[PDB]
Symmetry: C3
Subunit: 214 residues, 3 copies
């Protein structure tokens, strides 16, 4: 398989209609957020893309979210996948909605792709066409702007990144040097959206280059 999509799956999900007040204080949750949606999943960068997407479909924001040390392959149980997102809303109906934009997007939104027919190397070269509060809460991102979200193993990623800046006028806005918790590297770029698509292509060209050879 060329760059056949990798179908992420949801690993667990629950809503706390009404957080205990004590647990809530420990979370630093605003007064306006008394319901939480919790969601685990197979693929972490995708789940962070679904989360942000939930921020646009519903009235929620992500209270929390972080990944697992050596990936889902190594996860501590079939439940935790390799991410945990914690959405907060003013009530349970808003949070359900955010939960369902997240599921529909994890199952059928952004996706990693195989780097090689051998399906032992994966990557993500995905245009987020309009950013919500999650992705745009990060340094230097404008709310509502387009963005590229690029991920690949360490050497793959560094090269492919360079390649991308060289292929399209974009702005490297964020760079996770190589060892993220899951052991990949990523960066966020910005510019137009037809450019975050020129950029998005050279990155995959460069990841496919290393796979086949480098």
């Amino acid at each position: 398989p060329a760059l056949d999509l990798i179908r992420p799956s949801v690993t667990a999900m629950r809503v706390i209609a009404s957080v205990n007040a004590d647990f809530a204080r420990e979370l630093k949750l605003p007064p306006h957020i008394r319901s939480l949606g919790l969601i685990s999943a197979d693929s972490d960068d995708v789940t962070y893309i679904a989360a942000d997407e939930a921020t646009k479909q519903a009235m929620v924001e992500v209270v929390y979210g972080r990944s697992l040390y050596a990936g889902a392959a190594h996860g501590p149980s079939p439940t935790a996948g390799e991410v945990l997102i914690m959405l907060g809303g003013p009530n349970p109906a808003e949070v359900r909605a955010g939960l369902d934009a997240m599921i529909a997007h994890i199952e059928n939104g952004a996706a990693f792709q195989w780097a090689n027919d051998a399906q032992d190397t994966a990557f993500l070269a995905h245009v987020v066409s309009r950013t919500g509060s999650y992705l745009s809460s990060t340094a230097g991102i404008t709310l509502g702007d387009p963005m590229a979200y690029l991920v690949a193993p360490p050497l793959e990623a560094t090269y492919g990144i360079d390649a991308a800046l060289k292929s399209a006028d974009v702005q490297l806005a964020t760079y996770v040097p190589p060892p993220s918790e899951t052991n990949y590297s990523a960066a966020f770029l910005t510019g137009s959206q037809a450019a975050c698509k020129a950029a998005c292509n050279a990155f995959t060209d460069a990841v496919l280059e290393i796979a086949r050879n480098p």
Copy 2:
């Protein structure tokens, strides 16, 4: 198996009767501690519970102790398990004693339990009936007080925690948000001991809930 106990095992053990002075300075060890017991083990939270228990049976304190990035399943060798505790004493007899309270407690003290008959999800819902200097050295714990020590994969843990505060008047004293080094989450609660047992039950009810469904 329902919540059949998981029998932790000790992976290695040695006493340095008399630390090199140079190694000692690098450890920031008091003047009153010239002997070290080193101990590795299968199950990290249990080993931290055994350590604290050693602080009560013998004159030692834990000089060090930390866990391994993706769990014992992923450990770097059959030796290191997924924890390393370093006990310090005024001499080798004290430290042996602490080492032996630790072994007897790792092998037959606190224990994880299976979340599901499928034995792919584990958790820990254990009352520490009286805390020594290790567990009580942590923020807001009283020396000699009771405590609950709750651990579970990320979504399991968050939910189960909320559940517990809601089931018994306890105090969330410490909270390790989701990705600890081993990829679980935990929290310490306090109150009575019959309550750290009401709390300890809803947590397991809530972990069993997600296993079977959520």
Copy 3:
């Protein structure tokens, strides 16, 4: 196998002849460094030893380099191994040279050794006879001085370290307490070179002790 060598392998490699200026700024790269060599590999401490060795054969320095959370066994793809080194030079010929000192040294330089015939425990007890800018950039290392670089799982390492200070006048210069990203421990010692070899021996005696028993 006694302490049969473990043959590290290179997992990927590429040169960016000319970094994009934007990517370069994000790297904090000097004005004197416009070419990068990227290199991934099987064995991280060895690769950090090869890197430093490249600093002596060629005009390059390491711009970056870090390891992967649970080791190459758990790496995110067959490419990233468990390290990423990023060499910088004034041009592509210098960097090629550094890349080739690194390959020749990863494939046939420093090496882990099996702790036990069972080949489930590994370690590294290697004299770096003269240090370049990489290893010597670390606290308290003199440029051009000899050094011991000792690595072993957590309990193995702590013991073996103590053992080494006790066997030869050396100076513990750096100590990575137990859980490095790859889940081993290491330390750098200094003194003579016949001593960093007395030290280097007791460490392996002590790692072999735990393997067979402790």
